[PDB]
Amino acid sequence: KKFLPFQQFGRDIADTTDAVRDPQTLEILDITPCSFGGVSVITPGTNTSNQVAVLYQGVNCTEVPVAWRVYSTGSNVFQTRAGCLIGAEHVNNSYECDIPIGAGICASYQTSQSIIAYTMSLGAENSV
Amino acid sequence: AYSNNSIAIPTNFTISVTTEILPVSMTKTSVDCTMYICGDSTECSNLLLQYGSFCTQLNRALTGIAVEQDKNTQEVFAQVKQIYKTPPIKDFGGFNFSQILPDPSKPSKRSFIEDLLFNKVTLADAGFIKDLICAQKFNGLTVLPPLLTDEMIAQYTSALLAGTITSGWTFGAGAALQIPFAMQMAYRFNGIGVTQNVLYENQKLIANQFNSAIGKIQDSLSSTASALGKLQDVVNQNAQALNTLVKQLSSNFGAISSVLNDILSRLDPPEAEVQIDRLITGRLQSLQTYVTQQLIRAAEIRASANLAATKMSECVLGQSKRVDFCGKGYHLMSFPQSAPHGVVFLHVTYVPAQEKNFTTAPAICHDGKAHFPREGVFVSNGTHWFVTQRNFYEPQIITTDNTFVSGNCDVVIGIVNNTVYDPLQPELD
Amino acid sequence: KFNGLTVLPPLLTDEMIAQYTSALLAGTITSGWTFGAGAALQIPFAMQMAYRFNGIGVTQNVLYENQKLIANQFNSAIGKIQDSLSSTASALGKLQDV
Amino acid sequence: QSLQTYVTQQLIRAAEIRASANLAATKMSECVLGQSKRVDFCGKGYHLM
Amino acid sequence: QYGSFCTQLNRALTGIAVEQDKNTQEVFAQVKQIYKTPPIKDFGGFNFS
Ligand SMILES: *[C@@H]1O[C@H](CO)[C@@H](O[C@@H]2O[C@H](CO)[C@@H](O)[C@H](O)[C@H]2NC(C)=O)[C@H](O)[C@H]1NC(C)=O
Ligand SMILES: *[C@@H]1O[C@H](CO)[C@@H](O[C@@H]2O[C@H](CO)[C@@H](O)[C@H](O)[C@H]2NC(C)=O)[C@H](O)[C@H]1NC(C)=O
Ligand SMILES: *[C@@H]1O[C@H](CO)[C@@H](O[C@@H]2O[C@H](CO)[C@@H](O)[C@H](O)[C@H]2NC(C)=O)[C@H](O)[C@H]1NC(C)=O
Ligand SMILES: *[C@@H]1O[C@H](CO)[C@@H](O[C@@H]2O[C@H](CO)[C@@H](O)[C@H](O)[C@H]2NC(C)=O)[C@H](O)[C@H]1NC(C)=O
Ligand SMILES: *[C@@H]1O[C@H](CO)[C@@H](O)[C@H](O)[C@H]1NC(C)=O
Ligand SMILES: *[C@@H]1O[C@H](CO)[C@@H](O)[C@H](O)[C@H]1NC(C)=O
Ligand SMILES: *[C@@H]1O[C@H](CO)[C@@H](O)[C@H](O)[C@H]1NC(C)=O
Ligand SMILES: *[C@@H]1O[C@H](CO)[C@@H](O)[C@H](O)[C@H]1NC(C)=O
Ligand SMILES: *[C@@H]1O[C@H](CO)[C@@H](O)[C@H](O)[C@H]1NC(C)=O
């Protein structure tokens, strides 16, 4: 941004500063908020098992290791258009949707049992 | 020109195609209290715990709306659970469906008209992994992606068309049963009361009219701007509401300042509380207003989505007889297309034209007997009498195979004299 | 009214609505159900009733032999409607509630 | 606060009236401009007009 | 010092006010020619007066 020589700040629609001028070396710095988002826990019933997977919404995976932490070791970290998914492994088959994660992805609990994530299937194919 | 012995009958017809747009869903949104009100402040949070469970309730409400949206889409589009395909050879009797069938030369296999529709509407907040966009987002406001991507809805729509044109209305009741297309159309005329030999003798005419009507839809859509107002309104309203919510963070509500870090960096706690409390009250009221109006809009959209599901079941998978439910005229058939946040129906309909004048009568007295039409009506060409069907002028001689007898001819008001020809006697003649 | 409160007039006056209704009746009784699908095509009234019995599964024969009986019953029914309306008070509750 | 209460209740009533108006439009279109076969949609008995 | 409560209230009430006229238009404007009934009233014995 080209602060003119007489200017000092830059404000937001909600009256929050988002640029500034360093009072010693007169240069312009942008200010950006840190990352935030929800946390979704995906579970089969407690009657069936005590295992879970975790979804960090709208957050690129790298920043989860940056910031309980007994899962982020991973070995099965996966990046979906809905966020960063941890604790579930990716298969190549397509089934019908069981628990909806979003953006076309669902997850289920199956086989030595685990939690798998796949792309839902619309139905069988047929030619008249 | 009403009169008590005059009738008017059509002599030609016209095939009409028209469009209808319906909203189905809207944008899923999520808001976080403790960020919207007390951003990054522990004093404010401890002050907010004294209100109990307002914020849990707000989150539950918004989540309910968010789920209901996906339910809406599922009801409207998932009417079939096999993905039919159309054969490679396109001998459809002379009808041309090129502008509504899928097109492989695009990354998303959408047809021509679906591309026009997707370029007409200017959507925002797509929600996928990431301008007023970020200014909004920086305050606890997020947008979630829908469950069905835009490339799956297109598959559903192409399945519905392929089924409709290769099998008819049978795939909506059981297994799909094939049948040539021209014979399908003959059935669909017997549906509206026109004899079926009218199609086999005017087949090229009908095909040409259908093709031209599709062409006009195409250009009229490719030119005019305000076709899709109904969808744009939804988008606009959502954007506006969200914008005003963000603006309300600049107000004082009577404190010394609208910035929370200034109140915290000047005064000592026992006097900072008196000010922070005022800020909390104002902002909490702002959220409640937002959530209430969102609930009411969601109810409206649900009503519209149920209507669209009914039209899909009754106009596309069958042939409707309810008047003006699937267009103006006598319904023949319909085709679906998808548009951003909604659906578009193309209704194909039959409209008579070229009418003429005749004189009529209710019955015929022959030998002290009264003959009535089995199906049709008696008309006079000026000197002679004929029977015809009611929707298309096509006269025939009066015999004892297309009339039936009942009573003598002393009681009907307006009966006329003529002769009724017996088919067997000329064989015996 | 004297505290910021106002009432606006509707766009369609009460004579335009009456014109619309009279148009609908005239079309219905002179042409049948054809004016809702295209151009209006005329047809005598008795024959239109014969069609409308064929619509419910009764032969059209039945009407032409019983025409005066049917006409009389229709007229009497309309008469009862009007006087019953002219007598009882709470017919229109649904509107008064609004 | 009094104004906000007023406006909210008015919005809900308006929604109810809209539903009723859609029903009336359908009855005009199907009972008057045609002959209906849906049972009890246009009265009790077999519909004529 | 409260900002935009009043623009919101006026906006809501205006929305309702317009929707009313939309309702009436939908119900009654089903035709777009104004038919007339003939001067002679030979309707077969029925009486619509
Ligand atoms: C059937 O005949 C009637 C009566 O001749 C026609 O109605 C007349 O049409 C002319 C031309 O527009 C008018 O000047 C007369 O006023 C009409 N008569 C009445 C009573 O209104 C009618 O046009 C004819 N049908 C067709 C299809 O032409
Ligand atoms: C169906 O109609 C389309 C028109 O949209 C026809 O495709 C056009 O065919 C002409 C004939 O040479 C070409 O000049 C155009 O460039 C074509 N348009 C497009 C968009 O490809 C198509 O041929 C018709 N179907 C059949 C079987 O003829
Ligand atoms: C029914 O109407 C159609 C359409 O007007 C008539 O066919 C058209 O005739 C004109 C002149 O010959 C040309 O536009 C074409 O020959 C036809 N149009 C199309 C689109 O094919 C037809 O003649 C009319 N029916 C009768 C019996 O006259
Ligand atoms: C047709 O129109 C009306 C109804 O049949 C008749 O005029 C009046 O209608 C009332 C309706 O209750 C009846 O009491 C009478 O028939 C009439 N009242 C008076 C005071 O005259 C009219 O006579 C009927 N017949 C004709 C030829 O129009
Ligand atoms: C599941 O939990 C236990 C098994 O762990 C079983 O006894 C119980 O009946 C089950 N309850 C339900 C609701 O499935
Ligand atoms: C995630 O971040 C890495 C680097 O931080 C970047 O290379 C990658 O493109 C990002 N992916 C997404 C989906 O944001
Ligand atoms: C299996 O999945 C991997 C990525 O997970 C992909 O590269 C590969 O093409 C898939 N195999 C098949 C047959 O689809
Ligand atoms: C049709 O009417 C004319 C008189 O306008 C008549 O000459 C002709 O015979 C009639 N039709 C037939 C098939 O005779
Ligand atoms: C039709 O109107 C004429 C007019 O004079 C009349 O003579 C006749 O009885 C009426 N009814 C008919 C022709 O059935």
Coordinates of N, CA and C and ligand atoms in Angstrom, one line a residue, chain B residues 1 355-357, chain C residues 42, ligand 1:
Chain B
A1 N -68.5 -14.5 -29.2 CA -69.8 -14.5 -29.9 C -70.7 -15.7 -29.5
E355 N -58.8 -21.5 -35.5 CA -60.2 -22.0 -35.3 C -61.2 -21.5 -36.4
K356 N -62.3 -22.2 -36.4 CA -63.3 -21.9 -37.4 C -64.7 -22.2 -36.8
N357 N -65.7 -21.6 -37.5 CA -67.1 -21.6 -37.0 C -67.9 -22.7 -37.6
Chain C
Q42 N -66.2 -20.7 -28.3 CA -67.6 -20.6 -27.8 C -68.3 -22.0 -27.9
Ligands
LIG1 C1 -68.0 -16.8 -36.1 O1 -69.1 -15.9 -36.4 C2 -69.2 -14.8 -35.6 C3 -70.4 -14.0 -36.0 O2 -70.4 -13.6 -37.3 C4 -67.9 -13.9 -35.7 O3 -68.0 -12.9 -34.7 C5 -68.1 -11.6 -35.4 O4 -66.8 -11.2 -35.9 C6 -66.8 -10.0 -36.6 C7 -65.4 -9.8 -37.1 O5 -64.5 -9.5 -36.0 C8 -67.2 -8.9 -35.6 O6 -67.3 -7.6 -36.3 C9 -68.6 -9.2 -35.0 O7 -69.0 -8.2 -34.1 C10 -68.6 -10.6 -34.4 N1 -69.9 -10.9 -33.9 C11 -70.2 -10.8 -32.6 C12 -71.6 -11.3 -32.2 O8 -69.4 -10.5 -31.7 C13 -66.7 -14.8 -35.4 O9 -65.5 -14.0 -35.7 C14 -66.7 -16.0 -36.2 N2 -65.6 -16.9 -35.8 C15 -64.3 -16.8 -36.4 C16 -63.3 -17.8 -35.9 O10 -64.1 -16.0 -37.3

